[PDB]
Amino acid sequence: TATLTYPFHDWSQELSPRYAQLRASDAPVCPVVSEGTGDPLWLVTRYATAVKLLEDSRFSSEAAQASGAPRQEPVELRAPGTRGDAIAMLREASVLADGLGPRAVRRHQGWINDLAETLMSELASREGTFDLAADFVEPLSSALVSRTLLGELSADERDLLAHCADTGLRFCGVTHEEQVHAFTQMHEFFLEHARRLAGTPGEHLLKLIAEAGPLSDEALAEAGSLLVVAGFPTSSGFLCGALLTLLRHPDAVQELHAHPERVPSAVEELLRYTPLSTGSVKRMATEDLEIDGVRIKAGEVVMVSLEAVNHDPDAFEDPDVFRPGREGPMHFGFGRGRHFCPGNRLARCVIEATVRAVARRPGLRLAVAPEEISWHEGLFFRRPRAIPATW
Numbered sequence: 001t002a003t004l005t006y007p008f009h010d011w012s013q014e015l016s017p018r019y020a021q022l023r024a025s026d027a028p029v030c031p032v033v034s035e036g037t038g039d040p041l042w043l044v045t046r047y048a049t050a051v052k053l054l055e056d057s058r059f060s061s062e063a064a065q066a067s068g069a070p071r072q073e074p075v076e077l078r079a080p081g082t083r084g085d086a087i088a089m090l091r092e093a094s095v096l097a098d099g100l101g102p103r104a105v106r107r108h109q110g111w112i113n114d115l116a117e118t119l120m121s122e123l124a125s126r127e128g129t130f131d132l133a134a135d136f137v138e139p140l141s142s143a144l145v146s147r148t149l150l151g152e153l154s155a156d157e158r159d160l161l162a163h164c165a166d167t168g169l170r171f172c173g174v175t176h177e178e179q180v181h182a183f184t185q186m187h188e189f190f191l192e193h194a195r196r197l198a199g200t201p202g203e204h205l206l207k208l209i210a211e212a213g214p215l216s217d218e219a220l221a222e223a224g225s226l227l228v229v230a231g232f233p234t235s236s237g238f239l240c241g242a243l244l245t246l247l248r249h250p251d252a253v254q255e256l257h258a259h260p261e262r263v264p265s266a267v268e269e270l271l272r273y274t275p276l277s278t279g280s281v282k283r284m285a286t287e288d289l290e291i292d293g294v295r296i297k298a299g300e301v302v303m304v305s306l307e308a309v310n311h312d313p314d315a316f317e318d319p320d321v322f323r324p325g326r327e328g329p330m331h332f333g334f335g336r337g338r339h340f341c342p343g344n345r346l347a348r349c350v351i352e353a354t355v356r357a358v359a360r361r362p363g364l365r366l367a368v369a370p371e372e373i374s375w376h377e378g379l380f381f382r383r384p385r386a387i388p389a390t391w
């Protein structure tokens with residue numbers, strides 16, 4: 001139909017040209033229809049409009065996540081018959097941001113940098129082609145989720161939760177039943193194992209959540225699923241994407257090799273330039289309102305594509321250039337406003353460790369052309385199947 005269907009199927013790092021086309025249109029908000037549900041939705045692609053929306057207290061994230069809300073995802077991102085409201089459950093009993101804040105980074109940054117170095121040093125001993133996805137990103141992200149979020153996981157437990165996240169957080173490529181089963185299996189996993197994981201010694205967020213009426217098993221289980229959904233496919237997808245960006249810009253890496261104090265600025269530029277989500281963050285209007293002149297009715301859902309906003313030329317001169325010394329406005333890689341990613345400091349810590357491990361070792365290169373990289377089709381959070389690299 002003559003209403004655009006969403007999303008735009010841009011599963012690789014090449015962003016769909018439709019985002020820029022909509023950005024340049026005469027509407028600051030454009031109506032679309034969900035490909036998976038047929039729901040009508042609105043879509044924002046301009047930085048200036050996105051700022052207004054994500055800072056507007058009349059636009060509710062929680063309302064957009066409730067059952068029956070119009071939505072872009074093919075299945076509800078919850079186990080059927082459960083609330084799927086982990087953040088509000090944690091309020092009814094701040095711990096999220098509390099245990100991921102600057103103190104937590106100061107605790108974990110040491111081993112995070114140790115591990116990035118250990119992994120890269122092992123790759124420095126390899127012959128021919130090695131896979132940065134399997135043998136760098138996977139072990140680093142697995143350690144992050146175990147040590148900081150869930151507690152020590154077995155290899156099979158890590159594999160189960162990563163598979164559940166890959167299967168449920170998809171626009172296509174799996175059946176409806178497989179997607180529900182992923183969320184069901186994750187929730188049933190935490191109903192049985194959250195108490196044990198929380199009770200093991202360590203710093204992990206799930207322990208902090210549990211050890212602070214009493215906290216029900218269902219609430220602790222919802223917290224587990226939230227940490228997997230929010231922390232696992234995002235960290236793995238972004239670290240993969242950031243490595244690809246670095247490998248495609250050797251002049252930038254040579255700059256960071258000579259001047260390591262420039263790494264933090266390059267981390268911020270990676271968060272702006274490297275696309276992650278193939279969908280959009282979403283908010284529901286809780287009352288009739290206007291945003292930039294467009295009238296939105298109560299109950300309607302407006303989406304913001306963070307990738308589109310991060311590539312807006314009204315905000316970033318030459319937005320499609322990876323410019324590590326860039327001094328633009330704040331990017332949207334972590335969102336904006338009330339729901340700004342509480343994992344942002346930990347994520348920045350692991351991205352910085354990755355950038356430093358690459359910059360210290362001149363000669364790392366992609367083994368094939370970027371267009372030969374294969375991508376998992378339909379993931380919410382883009383990720384290549386492998387990153388073949390050589391010295």
Ligand code: HEM
Pocket residue numbers: 061087096100149226227230231232234235238239276281282306332333334335336338339340341342343344346347
């Ligand atoms: C590179 C890694 C990551 C990226 C790019 C990222 C990105 C984001 C973004 C864009 C949002 C905003 C969603 C919205 O506005 O609706 C968000 C929210 C959130 N993030 Fe992250 N994230 C990452 C890693 C993590 C990690 C490691 C955690 C660990 C706890 C985490 C926990 C959360 C939570 C709980 C929320 C929801 C906050 C709320 O709705 O109030 N994220 N993240």
